[PDB]
Write a protein that binds this ligand. Sequence first.
Ligand SMILES: C[C@H](CCC(=O)O)[N+](C)(C)C
Ligand SMILES: C[C@H](CCC(=O)O)[N+](C)(C)C
Ligand SMILES: O=C(O)CNC(=O)C(=O)O
Ligand SMILES: O=C(O)CNC(=O)C(=O)O
Ligand SMILES: NCCCCCCN
Ligand SMILES: NCCCCCCN
Ligand SMILES: [Zn+2]
Ligand SMILES: [Zn+2]
Ligand SMILES: [Zn+2]
Ligand SMILES: [Zn+2]
Ligand SMILES: [Zn+2]
Ligand SMILES: [Zn+2]
Ligand SMILES: [Zn+2]
Ligand SMILES: [Zn+2]
Lengths: 384, 384
Amino acid sequence: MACTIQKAEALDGAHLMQILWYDEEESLYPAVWLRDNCPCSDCYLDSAKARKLLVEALDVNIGIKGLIFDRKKVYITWPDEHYSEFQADWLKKRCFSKQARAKLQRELFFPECQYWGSELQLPTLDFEDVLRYDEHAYKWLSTLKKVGIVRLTGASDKPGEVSKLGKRMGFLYLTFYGHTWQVQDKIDANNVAYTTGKLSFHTDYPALHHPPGVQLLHCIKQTVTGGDSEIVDGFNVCQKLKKNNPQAFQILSSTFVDFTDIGVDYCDFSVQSKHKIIELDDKGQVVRINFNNATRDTIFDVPVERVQPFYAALKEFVDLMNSKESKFTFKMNPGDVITFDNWRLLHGRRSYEAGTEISRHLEGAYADWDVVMSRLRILRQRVE
Amino acid sequence: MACTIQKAEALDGAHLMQILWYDEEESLYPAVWLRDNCPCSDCYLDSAKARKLLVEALDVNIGIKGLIFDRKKVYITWPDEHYSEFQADWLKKRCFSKQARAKLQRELFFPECQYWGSELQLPTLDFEDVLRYDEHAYKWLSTLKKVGIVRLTGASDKPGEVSKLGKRMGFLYLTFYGHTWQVQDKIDANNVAYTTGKLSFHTDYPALHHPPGVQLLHCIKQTVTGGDSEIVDGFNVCQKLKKNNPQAFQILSSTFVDFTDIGVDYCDFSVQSKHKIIELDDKGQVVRINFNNATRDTIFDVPVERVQPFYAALKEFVDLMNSKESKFTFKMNPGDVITFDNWRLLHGRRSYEAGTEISRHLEGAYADWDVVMSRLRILRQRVE
Ligand SMILES: C[C@H](CCC(=O)O)[N+](C)(C)C
Ligand SMILES: C[C@H](CCC(=O)O)[N+](C)(C)C
Ligand SMILES: O=C(O)CNC(=O)C(=O)O
Ligand SMILES: O=C(O)CNC(=O)C(=O)O
Ligand SMILES: NCCCCCCN
Ligand SMILES: NCCCCCCN
Ligand SMILES: [Zn+2]
Ligand SMILES: [Zn+2]
Ligand SMILES: [Zn+2]
Ligand SMILES: [Zn+2]
Ligand SMILES: [Zn+2]
Ligand SMILES: [Zn+2]
Ligand SMILES: [Zn+2]
Ligand SMILES: [Zn+2]
């Protein structure tokens, strides 16, 4: 009844098609959009699922010349004698009502989000299960997207596990630190990560204009002397900051901060960026946190009078992150893997003791959110 | 005289340091910024060129407790007995005046830009020279950044040339179409690029939220039956559009368009995005064009009444691109490589004739702008 056509007609000087469905609801489709999206082999390459029609071939003032229909299809003639057929279900799905458009966007982008503080129950799955079963890989990625983190247990205590998950997603994201990389204490460390020092809350790689969306960290070896992990939900903290201190929020979401990274690892590099620490979309929703205090530059491109207020804002923001209501602490063991949203979470670690042998070793990697979402879309379809 | 210290003092309740240089100019440095950027081994890890100091250790209300100086350094004591030394040249470079900050930004980001239309003289270098000499690789990347395109001649007529340039930059950008990819006519083409059809002006990969910054295309084999290349400077076209049709400009720079790509190539994929076709920074400057008509989705997430005005805007934009004053046409020969800014240029190709053997073959690859700029920074330093 809902996707069965009861009536189709051209309206509004034939610039619009209206469908009355059998459930009595109505949908409207501009004529230019219909012509633009003609599925015939002239206009549309089915093997690629892509449009061949050029913008240059589209009359933006086009009207429908003729229309007939049955319960399942509309058949249209155009002023220049082009001919088009559209299927009822295809039409129904693309209805321009706010409700139909929003529903489809949810299905494409999995916007569901569950904010958390210290009460977090760390979502946890088995590693081999995730590699083997789509049902488990689906739960893995959907929870990663919704909650921002998933732990995987039962991996080995050897290099190569993040690489297997990378393949399960599709491919990992290559950076100047390599395809994968080793978090251990190193002589002449090119990065504070590669020391025994404390890492306060940070996102990885704000020195890139497109920081890694997803981070993977696998504990190969762990020390008893320290090295606990800490996470906080950045979207949650930002919401509390806007509430408690709209001025601090305003400064952090509007000020461009310079980040830097110079050194040699996979290649030799001299990397520079600018980002707003709290990054808002066009509707004012926080979509990314860009913040690592180690790689924030000495160069600070703001007028002198904006400097101290910036720091006072940043301090309020860091204090919220450290608050006992926001922060969640745990300690990784050999064979544990954490996979998390590096645009949303900030993470850190406690200091631990140097010695003459390596007491602590994680292997990490990155992946692009688009690569991950693509796998998520495919998995959902296979599972449903 | 300009970077020699004539006087240093604490001012403004000791919250500011003022330096009077020997050229009689003055610079101001907030106390909190100085403490934040103390270069001592407690605060700063020299092997990483990174800050160890935590935000949590920074008193945002800090003042200078004592200060002494000579011609080349300032020596500061802090209220908690921490001690800091700063070098005159380091200080001079980071001066918070608008002029000093802007100068340094130019040096970091190479903003110089030369807009062009049909009068373009295609910048051209030798391929092997670029692989061999830093002077030539520097000219290559600086011109790529400034002009948006460089041709390289004298490559071979065999696969693997884009890969060599990838290494010269650092590394190539892996996508679902592979590390490198073959533009040829293919049975069951997963993409309109892999046909003999005309490609109108487009950027590559707006189906990703972070489209490739730089594209490389190497002609292995060329057909006489068609297949000429066309380019246009997108930043130039946008400027003309804002002038001629501010309404069209407003629609294109504000409307989110959905892009899609579903198929199998390097991996199986189902990719979705949203972008504004004309993408503006926070000051209203165009920083990216995101537009491929083949991969623009059938799904169009706007209210019905915005649809036709969107198309009328897009048509004005495409017509400008096609104008004889904007467009530059040329034809690639075996051994030619084009490297260009895929955020700024749009490119296309003329149709050509199918046959039973492959008459036309290019190999392409992508690179990230951050990877390229890093190499650019390193090269400049080596050459100067
Ligand atoms: C880049 C990260 C550290 C975070 C950063 O520098 O932003 N590595 C662990 C070294 C791979
Ligand atoms: C992605 C490009 C075409 C452009 C596009 O689909 O956006 N390939 C040539 C197939 C690698
Ligand atoms: O060592 C850890 O526990 C966490 N490591 C990092 O956050 C890093 O390397 O960037
Ligand atoms: O075939 C050409 O000349 C140009 N190719 C493309 O723009 C492409 O593959 O995306
Ligand atoms: N069942 C209706 C088919 C209509 C074909 C029209 C071709 N011009
Ligand atoms: N040449 C001046 C060195 C000052 C050292 C001060 C240590 N507190
Ligand atoms: Zn139906
Ligand atoms: Zn058609
Ligand atoms: Zn980290
Ligand atoms: Zn290298
Ligand atoms: Zn000097
Ligand atoms: Zn110090
Ligand atoms: Zn292309
Ligand atoms: Zn794969």
